Amino acid sequence: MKDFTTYLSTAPVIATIWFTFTAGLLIEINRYFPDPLVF
Amino acid sequence: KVKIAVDRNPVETSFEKWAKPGHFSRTLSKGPNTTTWIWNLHADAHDFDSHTSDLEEISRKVFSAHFGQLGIIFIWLSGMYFHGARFSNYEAWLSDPTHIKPSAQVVWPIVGQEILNGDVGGGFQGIQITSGFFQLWRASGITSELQLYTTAIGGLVMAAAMFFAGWFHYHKAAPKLEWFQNVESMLNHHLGGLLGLGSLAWAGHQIHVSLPVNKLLDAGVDPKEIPLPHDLLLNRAIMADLYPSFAKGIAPFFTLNWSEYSDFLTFKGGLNPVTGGLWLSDTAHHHVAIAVLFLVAGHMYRTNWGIGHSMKEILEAHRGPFTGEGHVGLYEILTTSWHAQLAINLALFGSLSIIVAHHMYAMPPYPYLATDYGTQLSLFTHHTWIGGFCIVGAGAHAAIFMVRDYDPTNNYNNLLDRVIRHRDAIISHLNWVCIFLGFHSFGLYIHNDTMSALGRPQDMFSDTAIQLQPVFAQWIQNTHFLAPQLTAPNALAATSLTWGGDLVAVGGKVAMMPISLGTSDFMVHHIHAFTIHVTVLILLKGVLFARSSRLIPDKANLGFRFPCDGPGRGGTCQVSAWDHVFLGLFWMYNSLSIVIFHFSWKMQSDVWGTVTGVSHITGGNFAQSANTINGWLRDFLWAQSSQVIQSYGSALSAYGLIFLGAHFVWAFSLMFLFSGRGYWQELIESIVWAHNKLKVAPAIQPRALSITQGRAVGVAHYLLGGIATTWSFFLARIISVG
Amino acid sequence: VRPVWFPGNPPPAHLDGSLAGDYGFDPLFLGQEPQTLKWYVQAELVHGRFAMLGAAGIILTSIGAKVGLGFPEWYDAGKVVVEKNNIDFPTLMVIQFYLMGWAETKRWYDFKNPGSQADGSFLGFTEEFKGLENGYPGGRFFDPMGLSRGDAAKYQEYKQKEVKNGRLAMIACLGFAAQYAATGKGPLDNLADHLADPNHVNFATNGVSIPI
Amino acid sequence: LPGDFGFDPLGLLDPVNSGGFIEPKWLQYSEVIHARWAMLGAAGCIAPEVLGAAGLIPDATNIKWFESGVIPPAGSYNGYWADPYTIFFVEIVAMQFAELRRLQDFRYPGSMGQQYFLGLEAIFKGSGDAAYPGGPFFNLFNLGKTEAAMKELKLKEIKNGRLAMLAMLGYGAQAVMTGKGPFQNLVEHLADPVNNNILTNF
Amino acid sequence: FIGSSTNLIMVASTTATLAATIVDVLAMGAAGHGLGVGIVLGLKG
Ligand code: CLA
Ligand code: CLA
Ligand code: CLA
Ligand code: CLA
Ligand SMILES: CC1=C[C@H](O)CC(C)(C)[C@H]1/C=C/C(C)=C/C=C/C(C)=C/C=C/C=C(C)/C=C/C=C(C)/C=C/C1=C(C)C[C@H](O)CC1(C)C
Ligand SMILES: CC1=C[C@H](O)CC(C)(C)[C@H]1/C=C/C(C)=C/C=C/C(C)=C/C=C/C=C(C)/C=C/C=C(C)/C=C/C1=C(C)C[C@H](O)CC1(C)C
Ligand SMILES: CC1=C(/C=C/C(C)=C/C=C/C(C)=C/C=C/C=C(C)/C=C/C=C(C)/C=C/C2=C(C)CCCC2(C)C)C(C)(C)CCC1
Ligand code: SF4
C-alpha cells in the first residue's frame, strides 16, 4: 500500500490527476457560468 | 512429446517494482540524471530482448502482453456495443435504413460543442458514425438495444477474464520455453480450433439466427414483431415455414443428401437486390465450407502420435541445384527468434488487411452498406492504412532479426545466406526498375500537363489522344463476368457486379455498377506499382544491409537503432536499418495516399450516385481529368474540399477544425525532420542559464532530444498530420454529398 | 485462534486483535500504515455512530409513521419540517455547518496533536476535552455516566458491542437507501409487506434488484 | 489412484512441470466432485418419471427434468412454494457456505475445526486427504474400516460416478435431440429396438 | 437407407481405408468418411 501510493506519486499519474482536476474545474465553471468574455 | 509445461509462481505480485521506474533495465534502474532517461524509459519498456537474454522469460512476457492487448480490445468492443445500445439511434435506423444516418456518439451541452449533435434522423441528435457497426449488427440479427447491452456486459466480462489470464500466466502459472516451441501443435490447434471452430460456430449462428431474422427484415415486417432468436432455435416449425429443409432436420446431413439444404446453403452470387448486400445464405455456405476446410487443415502436423507431418522434414526436403542447402536451418530460426515470426506475421497480416479492404468494397457483405458511401470510404481507407503500417513493421522486425538473432554458424550456405550474398544484384535491379517505373509512369502525367498547357490535347496520353488501354485487366474482367456460364456452372450470377452486368440500386442510390478501366486507370495502377516498388526497395535494402555494407563493414556491432557513424567517409547519416524503416514510413504514406485518392475519386465519379439514368456524384470526370496533375489538383483536391472548408456553423465543423489542426501538426513535424539536436542543445543551454539565474534549474538536466528521437517525433507527427488531414477531408466530403 | 471474517485464511499482519471488531478484514490492504489505520479506526467509529443515530431515527419515525400519528416518512421529513415550520433551508444549513465544523475541527486537531485540546483555551475547560484513545473521548462531557474508567474489561466489551452495532447500523442505513430506491416505500412498510407474503414479496419480485 | 486404469491418452497427470488447476490433487478431487454431483443428477433426473410411471406421485408433478424450471424456455413448473429466483438466492447462500468451507479445507487442510461454527467443528476436522473427509457425519457408519475395503469402496464410487457422468451427458443429448425424458427413451427403445434409435430421430 | 448406394459407398470406403490401435482407427475412419463423402457427392454429378 505504501508502494501503491508511491506509484500514485509518480509524475504521469499526478499529471493525470491534476489535469483532470484543473480541466474539470474549468468545465464546471464554464457550465454554471456559460460563456464569460468580460469581468 | 507435446505436453503442458509450466513453472509455479515465478514472479511475486507486488507493488514494489511499480514504485521503481526503469526496474527492467540495469542502465535505467540507476535513476534519472538527465531528461534523456525518461524517453529511454518509454522507448525500451517493451523491448524484452534488451531486458534478458533468456528466451523463456521473454516468451512469457510477450504471452502476458498479448493477453493485455486482447483485454484492451475487449474493453473497446464492450464500449462500442454499450454506446450502440445507450447512446444511439439503432432501432430507429432499423425501421428506416435508407433515410436515417447511423449515429452512436453524443456530446454534452457545454461551450457550444452541442452543435456537433446534428440531425441524423430518427428523432435523434448526435455524431454520424462511419465505422459500420449498425450494418454488422443488423446482419447478425440484432434487433433491440437490450441484446447490444448484454453483448457489452459480456465483452467487459471477457476483458476481465483476459486481464486475469495475463496476470495468471505471468505471475502464478507461467509456461515453460518448450511449451512455446511446440509450433506444430500450435498450428494444429489454431487451424482447427481458432479458424475452423470459429467459422463453424459462426456458420451455426448464421444458419440459426441471422438468416431467418434478416429474411423477415427483407420481407418488411416490423423488427419488434419478428420472433426472438431463441424461439427460432426452440420451435423448428417456424424454421420450416421459412425454409422447408429444416422440417427434415439433420437427417439429410448424416445421410449425405446435402442437396436438400439448398434453401439456406446457396450459390446465388451478386447482391441482395432489395438490400444491396451479399446473400446471407451464400455467406452461411461459405463459412461452412471454410470451417470444414480449416478443420481438415488442422490435422496435418504430428504431435503425440505417429500420424502427421513434421515441419523441419518438409523444409529440409525441398532442396535444389540452384539454391544448395535450400530451406535447411529455417525451422531453427523461426522457433527461436520472435522478431522473424513477427516480421512474417506482420507482412501477411498487413497484406490480408489490404485484401479485406478491396474485397469488402467490391463485394459488400453487409446489408445497407454499399449505399452508406461514408462507411464504404471509411472502411476501405482505414484497413488500407492499417495494412501499410503492418507491412512497414514487417520490414522493421525483419531487420531487427537480421541484427540481433542472425547467427551464420548455424546458417551457412542457405537461402538467407545466398540472399545476403547477392544483395548488391538484388538492390541494383530493384533500383533500376524503380527509376524506370518512376520515369515512365510519372512522366506520362508530366507529358500530359505539358501538352495540355501548350494547347495540344491531341498529343496527350488519354482515351481520345494516344490511348494506353489496360487490355489485360479488361480481359480478366470480361472473363470473370462470363465465368458463371461456362467455368462456374452452378453460379447464378457473378461474384461481383464490378466485372460487368446490370445495376443494383437501393433507395435511389447506386449500390454497385460495372467499373470500366481506361487510360487513367492504367496510369494510376502503374503509379501504385512504382510507389510500392520504391517502398519495397527502401525496406528490403534496410534488411539486406542491416549487418554490413561497403560503407560500414561492421554495422551490426552498432546495433539496429543508432544515429550514424560520424561525419567521416563523406557522411554516414541514416545508415541504420531503423532509418530505413523511417524512410519506408514516409514512402508508405505517399503510396497509400495515392491509393485512397484513386479509390475516392473513382468511386465518386464512375460508381456512386443517385438513380432517377444514373447521376454520379462528380458526373464522370475521372476518365478525362485523371491524366494530368492539374486535374487531380483542381477536380479532386480543390473541388472536393468545398464541403470541409464550408463546414463551419454546422455539425461537420469538427472536420474543419481537424483539417486545420492536421495541417498544423504536419507542418509542425517539419521542424523536427529538417533540423538537428546540436542547435536545440545550445538553445537549451541559454535557457538553462536563464533558469539558473532565478534558482529554477531542475535537478534532472534538460537535454535536447536524440537524433533518432528527433527523426521518430518527426515521422510520427508527419504521419498523424497527413493521415488526419485526408481523414477530415474524406469524412466531411462523403458525409455532406452522401 | 481468534475468529476471522473468512475461516481458513490467516489475518493480515497489521490487524492484531487489539482493535475492537478486529476480524482481519482488510483484503485491499487499505490500512497497512499504522497512522492510516489509526485514522480509519476513527473514521469507522464516526460513520458507525452517525449510522446508529440515524438508523434509530429512521426506525422510530417509521414506527410513528405506520401507526396513524402523522409522522412523515424519512425521505419527506426534511421537506415537511422546512415547510411546516417557517424555517429557511440555507440558514439552518449554515448554522449546522458552524456548530458541526467547530466540534469536528476540535476532533481533527486532537487527532493531529493527541492531547492538545485540553489546554484551557476553550472556555476554561481542561481534561474534559482530553481524549482517552483514538475515537474514544471520554471525560465528564462525552462520558458523563462514567463507564470507561471502572471495570476496564467490561469497557472493552462495550467497545466490541459499539463497533458491532455500528457496522450493523451502517449496513442497515445502506439498506434503507437501496430499499427505498427499489421499492419507493418506507422501510417498515416493506417489513409489513415481507410479513404479509414472505415467499412472494422480497427483492426477487421487484424487477429491480435482479432484472431477469 | 482410485480408478487408475491407465487411460490417460492426453497425459494430464504428469507430475513433472505441473501447476495451476492441472495437478493430480485438483484433477482427482474434481473428478470425484463431478462424479458425486452426477450421481445425484442421474437419480434426480430419473426419479419423477419412474415415480409417475409406478403411480406413486401425482400427475401434477412427475414432469420431465428439463421442465422443472432449470430452463424456463423449455418449461417451468408453477406450484413451488416461491418463485425460482427466491429459491435461487437461498441456493446461492447455502451453496456459497458449503462449497466455500469445502474450498477452505482443500487449501488449508484441517482449518475447519478451529473457528466456532455453532459446535460444528469436530465434524469438519477432515483428514490429511481431500475428497474423503469422513468424521462423524460425512462417514456416519464406520464403512471401510479395513483399508482394502476402503480402497474397494473408493473404486466402486469412482466407477458408479463415471457411469453416472456418462448418463448425465446422455440425458442432456437425449433431451435436446428427441425432446423427451430419459425413461420415455427407455420405453421407446424397449418397445421398438430397431425403429427407435439415434438413427431414427435424425 | 440400409442397402442404398450411399451406404455401400461409405461402408466400402471405410473398409478400404481400415484394411490399408485406436489412433489408426480414428485416422483411417476419418479418411474413409472424407473419401466416401467425396465419392457420393461426386457420383451425383
Ligand atoms: C473503450 C473505449 C471507449 C471510449 C473512447 C468511450 C468514450 C466515451 N464514453 Mg464510453 N464507455 C465505454 C467505452 C468507451 N467510451 C465502456 C467500456 C463503458 C461501460 C463501462 C462505457 C460507458 C459510458 C457511459 C455510461 C457514458 C460514457 C460516455 C463516453 C463519452 C465521454 C466520456 C467521459 O467524459 O467520461 C468522464 C471522464 C472521466 C471519468 C475522466 C477521469 C479519468 C481518470 C481521472 C484517470 C485516472 C488515471 C488512472 C490511473 C487510470 C484510470 C483507472 C480506471 C480504473 C478509473 C466518450 C465519448 C458518456 C457519454 O457518452 O455521454 C453522452 C457517458 O455518460 N461511456
Ligand atoms: C484450439 C485451441 C486454441 C485456440 C482457440 C487458441 C486461440 C488463440 N491463441 Mg493459441 N495456443 C494453443 C491452442 C489454442 N489457441 C495451444 C495448444 C498452444 C501451445 C502450442 C497455444 C499457444 C499460443 C501462444 C504462445 C499464443 C497463442 C495466442 C492465441 C490467440 C491469438 C489471438 C487471436 O487472433 O484470436 C482471436 C481472439 C479470440 C477468438 C478471443 C477468444 C479467446 C477465448 C479464450 C477462446 C480461446 C480458447 C482458449 C485456448 C481456451 C482457454 C481455456 C483456459 C481457461 C485454460 C487466440 C485466442 C496468442 C495470444 O494472443 O495469447 C494471449 C499467443 O501469443 N496461443
Ligand atoms: C456449429 C454450431 C452449431 C450449433 C451449436 C448448432 C445447434 C443446433 N442445430 Mg444446427 N447446424 C449447423 C451448426 C450448429 N448447429 C450447421 C453448420 C448446419 C448446416 C449443415 C446446421 C443445420 C441444422 C439443421 C437442418 C437443424 C439444426 C438443428 C440444431 C439444434 C439441435 C441439434 C441437435 O439435435 O444436436 C444433438 C444434440 C446435442 C449436440 C446436445 C448437446 C449436448 C448437451 C447440451 C449436453 C448437456 C450435458 C449436461 C451434463 C446436462 C445439463 C446438466 C445441467 C442442467 C446441470 C441445435 C440448436 C435442428 C434445429 O432444431 O433447427 C432449428 C435442425 O433441424 N442444425
Ligand atoms: C516530389 C518530390 C520528389 C521527387 C521528384 C522525388 C524523386 C525521387 N525520389 Mg525522393 N523523396 C521525396 C520526394 C521526391 N522524390 C521526399 C519528400 C523524401 C523524404 C521522405 C524522399 C526520400 C526518398 C527515398 C528514401 C528514395 C527516394 C528516391 C527517389 C527517386 C526515385 C527513382 C525514380 O523514379 O526516378 C525517376 C525520376 C523522377 C520520377 C523525377 C522526375 C523526372 C521528370 C518527370 C522527368 C525527367 C526529365 C527532365 C524533365 C529533363 C530535364 C532537362 C533539364 C535539366 C534541361 C526519384 C528521383 C528513391 C531512389 O532514388 O531509389 C531508386 C529512394 O530510395 N526519395
Ligand atoms: C472495510 C473495508 C476494508 C477493505 O480494505 C475494503 C472494503 C471491502 C471496500 C472496505 C469495506 C467498506 C464498506 C463495506 C463500507 C460501507 C460503508 C457504509 C455502508 C457506510 C454507511 C454509513 C451510513 C451513515 C453514516 C448513515 C447515516 C444516516 C443518517 C445520518 C440518516 C439521517 C436521516 C434521518 C435520521 C431521517 C431524516 O428524515 C433524513 C435523514 C437525514 C436521511
Ligand atoms: C478421461 C480423460 C482422460 C484424458 O486424459 C483426457 C480426456 C479425454 C479429456 C478425459 C475425458 C473426460 C471426459 C469424458 C469427461 C466427461 C465428463 C462429463 C460427461 C461430465 C458430466 C458431469 C455432469 C454433472 C456433474 C451433472 C450434474 C447434474 C446435476 C447436478 C443435475 C441436477 C438436476 C436434477 C437432479 C433434476 C432437476 O431437473 C434439476 C437439475 C439441476 C437439472
Ligand atoms: C477388429 C475387431 C473388432 C472390431 C472392431 C470394430 C468393428 C471397429 C470399428 C471401428 C469403426 C467403425 C471406426 C469408425 C470410425 C469413423 C470415424 C472416426 C469417422 C469420422 C468422421 C469424420 C471425421 C467426418 C468428417 C466430415 C464431416 C464432419 C463433414 C465434412 C466431410 C467429412 C466427411 C470430412 C472386435 C472388437 C469386434 C473384435 C476384435 C477385433
Ligand atoms: S550527427 Fe547527425 S549529421 Fe553528424 S553524422 Fe551523425 S547523423 Fe549525420
From TrEMBL, chain C:
Chlorophyll a 18 binds at H194, N202. Chlorophyll a 11 binds at G138, Y155, E162. Chlorophyll a 9 binds at G138, E162. Chlorophyll a 8 binds at E104, R107. Its main location: plastid. Chlorophyll a 15 binds at K164, N165. It is found in: Plastid, Chloroplast thylakoid membrane. The keyword Nucleus does not apply. Chlorophyll a 14 binds at E162. Chlorophyll a 12 binds at G138, E162. Chlorophyll a 19 binds at F203, N206. Keywords: Chlorophyll, Chloroplast, Chromophore, Photosynthesis, Photosystem I, Photosystem II, Plastid, Thylakoid. Chlorophyll a 13 binds at K161, N165. Chlorophyll a 20 binds at S209. Chlorophyll a 16 binds at T183, F203, N206. GO terms for molecular function: chlorophyll binding. GO terms for biological process: photosynthesis, light harvesting in photosystem I; response to light stimulus. This is Chlorophyll a-b binding protein, chloroplastic.
